[PDB]
Homo-oligomer: A and B are copies of this chain.
């Protein structure tokens, strides 16, 4: 509920389906610890990554496996992945939607931040 990932395909004009997403959180020792992972549905959305209880203050990295996505469609893309890094919940709990728009040599990422 508090963290949602949405992925679109700018070549097909469709949701980007079956995109792997890995979420990390910066530990006290300054390393990235595994936080959550999943894959986008037929709507291009990934719900259920985390809960309000687990999604504490921190620096999060959302790694979107754009390379595996493009290669499964028989295409050779430029990027290894799309990485989104942000501080979460510094002024109290929020809801974060990370949107990504994918092309083989280009991506954009947008954060929609709402107060529940």
Report A's interface with B, CB cutoff 8 A: 8-15, 59, 78-81, 83-87, 99, 101, 103-114
Distance (whole angstroms) from the CB of A31 to the closest CB of chain B:
11
* Chain A, interface SS category: strand
Copy number in this complex?
Answer: 4
B110 touches A105 (CB 8 A): yes
B85 touches A13 (CB 8 A): no
Q: Which residues of B contact A84 (CB under 8 A)?
A: 79
Instruction: Given contact pairs A10-B105, A106-B111, enumerate 6 new A-B contacts (beta carbons under 8 Å).
Output: A8-B112, A10-B104, A13-B106, A15-B114, A79-B85, A80-B85
B106 touches A108 (CB 8 A): yes
Q: Which residues of B contact A112 (CB under 8 A)?
A: 8, 13-15, 105
Distance (whole angstroms) from the CB of A103 to the closest CB of chain B:
4
Q: Which residues of B contact A86 (CB under 8 A)?
A: 78-80
Distance (whole angstroms) from the CB of A37 to the closest CB of chain B:
18
